[PDB]
Amino acid sequence: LKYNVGDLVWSKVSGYPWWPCMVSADPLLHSYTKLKGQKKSARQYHVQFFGDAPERAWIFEKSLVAFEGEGQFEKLCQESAKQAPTKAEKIKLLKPISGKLRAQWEMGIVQAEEAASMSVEERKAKFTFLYVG
């Protein structure tokens, strides 16, 4: 497996910029990786999106990149724009992101860069979400 709980990754979701994340256990499934439809081609990882408006998701491994730092972001943007197969898909990819989401992303980057400087256990202790059902 490429990742484990506490590993830092960028996640790409349609409609959002590459976003800093931490691999975590799903609080119901008690799993951090699975194969969608039990297809060997469809491995997903469970991730927390860093920032002040917490979200989690199951994300395909094909849409994860190991997180080093904010310095990666420009290349990630450039490669996604070059890979957009059509003019129409590229226009969708490049739509502006709100100021409110930009500030969430920027706070996410601060958390992820702090997380990177920490041990796996330290970052899990600090950043793991609380769930209430």
Chain contacts with ligand V01 (rule: CB under 6 A): 13, 16, 19, 49, 51-58, 101, 104, 108
Q: Are 126 and 24 in contact (CB under 8 A)?
A: no
Q: Closer CB to ligand V01, residue 75 or residue 102?
A: 102
Q: Distance between alpha carbon 94 and the CA centroid of its chain, in Å?
A: 18
Q: Closer CB to ligand V01, residue 57 or residue 77?
A: 57
Q: Are 87 and 6 in contact (CB under 8 A)?
A: no
- Name the closest residue to ligand V01 (Cβ): 51
* Distance of alpha carbon 48 from alpha carbon 23, whole angstroms: 6
Going 84 to 88 to 91 to 94, the CA torsion angle's sign is negative
Phi–psi pair at 35, nearest 5 degrees: -100, 120
Length of the chain: 133
Residue 3 C-beta: closest distance to ligand V01, Å: 17
Q: Are 81 and 90 in contact (CB under 8 A)?
A: yes
Residue 79 C-beta: closest distance to ligand V01, Å: 17
Residue 5 C-beta: closest distance to ligand V01, Å: 17
Q: Closer CB to ligand V01, residue 56 or residue 124?
A: 56
Q: Closer CB to ligand V01, residue 87 or residue 128?
A: 128
Residue 49 C-beta: closest distance to ligand V01, Å: 3
